[PDB]
């Protein structure tokens, strides 16, 4: 805990990348977060909107 | 220009699917144009 400034740079880089990867799982109002669901469940005209 | 049964007309649109769209006539997903139709029982055969 003496080196808390350097350990903060390590922790902030890891936290930012984990959040950027976790945000792939979110819907953003779409029918699924899995891109292959949308392409297989729906016709092109509906899939492009989702 | 073509003749179909009246129920098939719903397939004459960009990005549609069904028997006409699969096997006779299809419009591209970005079509610019007009689709015009009418019942024509003088041709009824």
Q: Give the DSSP letter string of A1-50.
A: -TTHHHHHHHHHHHHHHHHHHHTTS--TTSS-S-HHHHHHHS-HHHHTT-
The answer to whether A30 and A42 are in contact (CB under 8 A) is: no
- Do B14 and A43 count as a contact with CB atoms less than 8 A apart? no
Look-up: residue for tokens 């769209």?
B21
Instruction: Give the other-Cβ count within 10 Å of A37's Cβ.
Output: 14
Q: How many cross-chain Cβ pairs, A to B, lie less than 8 Å apart?
A: 8
Look-up: residue for tokens 């891109």?
A35
Look-up: residue for tokens 């699917």?
B17
Residues of A with Cβ-Cβ distance to B29 under 8 angstroms = 44-45
Tell me which residue of B30, B10, B35, B38 sits closest to A48, measured CA to CA.
B30
| Length, in residues, of chain A | 50
Dihedral Cα A32, A34, A35, A37, nearest 10 deg: -70
């Amino acid at each position: 805990s003496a080196l808390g400034k350097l350990q903060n740079v390590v922790n902030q880089n890891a936290q930012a990348l984990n959040t950027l990867v976790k945000q792939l799982s979110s819907n953003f109002g779409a029918i699924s977060s899995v891109l292959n669901d949308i392409l297989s469940r729906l016709d092109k005209v509906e899939a492009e909107v989702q | 220009s073509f003749v179909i049964r009246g129920d098939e007309v719903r397939q004459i649109a960009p990005g549609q699917t069904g028997k006409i769209a699969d096997y006779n006539y299809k419009l591209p997903d970005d079509f610019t144009g007009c689709v015009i139709a009418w019942n024509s029982n003088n041709l009824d055969n």
